[PDB]
Amino acid sequence: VFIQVGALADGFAPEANTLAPVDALVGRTLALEDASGAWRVHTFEPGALQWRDAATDTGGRAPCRVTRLRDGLYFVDYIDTTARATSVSLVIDLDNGVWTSVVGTLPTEADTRIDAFTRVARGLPLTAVDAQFRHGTLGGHARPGPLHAPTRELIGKRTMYRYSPTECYEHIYLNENFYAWQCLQGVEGGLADVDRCHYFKMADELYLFVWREKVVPTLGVVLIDLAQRKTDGKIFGYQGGDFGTLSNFQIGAYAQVLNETVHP
Amino acid sequence: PVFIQVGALADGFAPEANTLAPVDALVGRTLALEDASGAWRVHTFEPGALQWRDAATDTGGRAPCRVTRLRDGLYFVDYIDTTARATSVSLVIDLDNGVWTSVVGTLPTEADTRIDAFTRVARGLPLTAVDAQFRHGTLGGHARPGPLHAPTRELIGKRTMYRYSPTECYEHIYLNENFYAWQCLQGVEGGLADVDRCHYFKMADELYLFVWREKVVPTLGVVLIDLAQRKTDGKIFGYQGGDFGTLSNFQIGAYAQVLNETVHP
Ligand SMILES: [Ca+2]
Ligand SMILES: [Ca+2]
């Protein structure tokens, strides 16, 4: 039995291994620029941010979470309420002057009703959750470091993630495009799927992992720190099966790499 | 990037396949497959074909079939049952111990496949529309038959690679009692993967019957996995194309290698 993201949130809530937010960006105004030009200015306040598309000076204010799993890199997550069912996650490396954004959109009902076999017929992706990625530099930072880029370094690992004493999953990073997950313990106990995913390298042994689910529409965004054996991220989906209220909740886990598989 | 139709998969798996030779060992035999409820289906073998008679529906038919022998005493029989829409019948028969398992599988109609996964979730329906019914029994007239086949947890936790031919190679990861992941390492589906609904049964020491039912491209897979001999023998069944018309049912066989075993603390 598969479950809605709002019920997932409820299972992940208590005794979670989540990082405590930091206020370290409060008072900063960060100009995120990329190869297309200025993208979005973000000004941080306690618990919240104001964002402005650099071109139109159009944006919003949103409650936001900022966490710092590894020193010098900040994960910022907020819902963009000027758009339908959209979340925005950033990883900002202050000392290198580089950033990655993930802008995620959940599907309409009409999209979800196009079944997988028809999607096969039409050459459409199986997941209807959309994710756009940008990789840029921080305006005003002299001599920024290299842009973040895709990585193959997780492929072949099988890792267990203890999200709390009652929630535990494993991921198996199959290839550049797909990973398998299963819930070992939790409200999704015994469930498993393969889903579309994306891997980026943020720093030595630090990865940004993004997935997009095809059964229950879900966007996951997590930073995986294999040196600390810890992860920090979020899950975004509809609270229920009615395409209305959104669920966007913090997750964090202790990580254990169970094995590495090499195919001769 | 790209899923393919079963007919294309058949074409990819055809050349230099690691399949077993079909055998004519059962020609002239009538096997009376019985279960606890009574007679199930009697099968009489002739060269390349069998005749069957179904006790409960009182019906019969003739069909071409394949019979293969992976392990001594144990026979895999497969046929399309043309008397019903899009139905396949696979038997594992152990002539040493006098026991059998059957898988009767049905491919979904087009209307059924159009019910999307999220709607299935909201209604509590299975995600795969492929149906499989299992029976286990004894062979009629077989003295002192051995224990029945039954479900097994013995493959759970294994990760195995299967080389079906020089150009076709998949791995399976047996996640739990209901589900496994697969990935195509080399072949016409190269780089594709999914998780699908599966079933595991133990036929003999280190010999398993694995059945899976796919949720993206409707497909039934039935395979004997012999971990002692490091070899598999079975079939894949689906539609040739995306039009719910002609059926594909083709033999597979692979050289197996267990890559690792995963225990979760
Ligand atoms: Ca999920
Ligand atoms: Ca398949």
Q: How far is CA B140 from the centre of its chain?
A: 24
Rounded distance, CA B124 to CA B75, Å? 37
What is the dihedral angle through the alpha carbons of B256, B18, B234, B86, rounded to the nearest 10 degrees?
130
The pairs formed by A147-151 with CB atoms below 8 angstroms and a separation of 24 or more are: A147/A98, A148/A91, A148/A98, A148/A99, A148/A100, A148/A200, A148/A201, A148/A202, A148/A208, A149/A200, A149/A201, A150/A176, A150/A198, A150/A199, A150/A200, A150/A201, A151/A199, A151/A200, A151/A201, A151/A207
Nearest to B90 by CA among B241, B246, B233: B233
Rounded distance, CA A144 to CA B201, Å? 58
A–B CB contacts, 8 A cutoff, strictly below: 103
Sort strands B49-54 and A192-203 into parallel, antiparallel or unpaired: unpaired
Using alpha carbons only, give the angle A256, B265, B175 rounded to the nearest 5 degrees.
85
Contacts of B262 (CB under 8 A, 6+ apart): A158, A258, A259, B157, B159
B2 in Cβ contact with B235 (< 8 Å): no
Rounded distance, CA A235 to CA A219, Å? 6
Backbone angles phi, psi at A43, to 5 degrees: -120, 125
B91 in Cβ contact with B81 (< 8 Å): no
What are the C-alpha distances in Å from A1 to residues B17, B107, B124?
37, 22, 7
3-class DSSP state of B10: helix
Nearest to B237 by CA among B7, B3, B4: B7
What are the C-alpha distances in Å from B58 to residues B32, B36, B132, B188?
14, 18, 21, 43
Task: Determine whether the interchain pair B121/A216 forms a contact, defined as Cβ–Cβ distance below 8 Å.
Answer: yes
Contacts of A231 (CB under 8 A, 6+ apart): A69, A161, A222, A223, A224, A225, A251, A252, A253, A255
Q: Resolution of the deposited coordinates, in angstroms?
A: 1.9
A134 in Cβ contact with A147 (< 8 Å): no
Find chain A residues with C-beta within 8 A of B218's C-beta.
117
Rounded distance, CA A143 to CA B43, Å? 78
Task: Determine whether the interchain pair A2/B259 forms a contact, defined as Cβ–Cβ distance below 8 Å.
Answer: no
Dihedral (CA of A184, A189, A195, A201) sign = negative
Q: How far apart are the first and last CA of chain A?
A: 36
Task: Determine whether the interchain pair A120/B217 forms a contact, defined as Cβ–Cβ distance below 8 Å.
Answer: yes
B174 in Cβ contact with B180 (< 8 Å): yes
- In this structure, the number of other CB atoms found within 10 A of the CB of residue B200 comes to 21
Largest separation between any pair of C-alpha atoms in chain A: 54
Contacts of B263 (CB under 8 A, 6+ apart): B157
Task: Determine whether the interchain pair B117/A115 forms a contact, defined as Cβ–Cβ distance below 8 Å.
Answer: yes
Task: Determine whether the interchain pair A114/B116 forms a contact, defined as Cβ–Cβ distance below 8 Å.
Answer: yes
Q: How far is CA B169 from the centre of its chain?
A: 18
The region, left, alpha or beta by phi > 0 then psi within -120 to 50, assigned to residue B244 is left
Contacts of B243 (CB under 8 A, 6+ apart): none
Amino acid symbol at A232? D
B130 in Cβ contact with B88 (< 8 Å): no
B18 in Cβ contact with B163 (< 8 Å): yes
Scan for tokens 């990935």, then name that residue: B183
Mutate to test the interface with A, among B116, B168, B261, B262 (most CBs of A within 10 A): B116
- In this structure, the number of other CB atoms found within 10 A of the CB of residue B244 comes to 19
* Chain B interface, Cβ < 8 Å to A: 1-3, 113-119, 121-122, 124, 127, 159, 161, 171, 173, 175-179, 181, 183, 185, 191-195, 215-218, 242, 259-260, 262, 264-265
Q: Which of A170, A194, A214 sits opposite B193 (nearest CB)?
A: A194
Element (H, E) at B12: helix B6-13
Dihedral (CA of A153, A158, A164, A165) sign = negative
Nearest to A66 by CA among A53, A58, A75, A57: A75
What are the C-alpha distances in Å from B251 to residues A40, A137, B231?
57, 55, 14
Find chain B residues with C-beta within 8 A of A241's C-beta.
118, 121-122
8-state DSSP, B20: P
Rounded distance, CA A89 to CA A69, Å? 14
Element (H, E) at B6: helix B6-13
Task: Please compute, for residue A197, the number of CA atoms within 13 A of its CA located in the half-sphere on the CB side.
Answer: 30
Find chain A residues with C-beta within 8 A of B119's C-beta.
112-113
- Lookup: tokens for B245: 């018309």
Sort strands A86-93 and A73-80 into parallel, antiparallel or unpaired: antiparallel
B100 in Cβ contact with B142 (< 8 Å): no
Residues at the binding site of B for Ca(2+) are 189, 214
- Lookup: tokens for A209: 């992992």
Amino acid symbol at B214? E
Rounded distance, CA A120 to CA A118, Å? 5
Amino acid symbol at B159? R
What are the C-alpha distances in Å from B152 to residues A182, B171, B212?
20, 20, 15
Q: Per residue, what are the HEC states of chain A? A: CCCCHHHHHHHHCCCCCCCCCCCCCCCCEEEEEECCEEEEEEEEECCEEEEEECCCCCEEEEECEEECCCCCEEEEEEEECCCCCEEEEEEEECCCCEEEEEEEECCCHHHHCCCHHHHHHCCCCCCCCEEEEEEEEECCCCCCCCCCEECCCCCCEEEEEECCCCCEEEEEECCCCEEEEEEEECCCCCCEEEEEEEEEEEECCEEEEEEECCCCCEEEEEEEECCCCEEEEEEEEECCCCCCCEEEEEEEEEEEEEEECCCC
| A208-226 as b/e: b if 16+ CB within 10 A | bbbbbbbbbbbbbbbbbbb
Rounded distance, CA B232 to CA B216, Å? 24
What is the dihedral angle through the alpha carbons of B150, B151, B157, B158, rounded to the nearest 10 degrees?
50
Rounded distance, CA B231 to CA B207, Å? 10
Burial class (CB in 10 A: 0-12, 13-18, 19+), A50: middle
Distance (Å) from the alpha carbon of B256 to chain A's nearest alpha carbon: 13
Find chain B residues with C-beta within 8 A of A214's C-beta.
117
- Lookup: tokens for B210: 């694995």
Q: How large is the C-alpha radius of gyration of chain B?
A: 18
Rounded distance, CA B115 to CA B113, Å? 5
